Symmetry: C2
Subunit: 94 residues, 2 copies
Amino acid sequence: MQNFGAQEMRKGRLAFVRLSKLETLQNLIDKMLAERVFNKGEAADILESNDIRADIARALIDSVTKKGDVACSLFAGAIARQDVVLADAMGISQ
Amino acid sequence: MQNFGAQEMRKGRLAFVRLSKLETLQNLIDKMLAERVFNKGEAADILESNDIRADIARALIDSVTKKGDVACSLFAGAIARQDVVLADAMGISQ
């Protein structure tokens, strides 16, 4: 441990949100599962960010589609090379 | 090369939003940058509007803070062991 309470964690919040790397966040969450601070449901919730994920997907595919057929065709080739199942669900050749 | 234009891309839109993994999405953004489909400004619009990392960080530190001082102290201990810059910025000594 360290002697560092909730008052001190509130004062450190902005730095933590700004500066923490994603790899650090995943390890911290695993460490709080190992210490029994989190149960699996809580860790799952913290990790889940499907709404932002889907919003990234909308922005990406909408930016591609606006550029027309040649961009869409490059995009579809790249999807096939990245995830075969997603390509197949979309109608893309593999 | 595929011939997979905008029409087909719109018909696969809902599958792409629901089924894409986050790592796929980040890879595709890099690929579309590589292919000169995007300029650096476009690839950053997509990502900077939708920071999953910041979302995970806020949910994490707020779960810990609400559990009180022991949990906060364990959390601070693990931060110090992970990232010395984060630890220094938040007031944690190491």
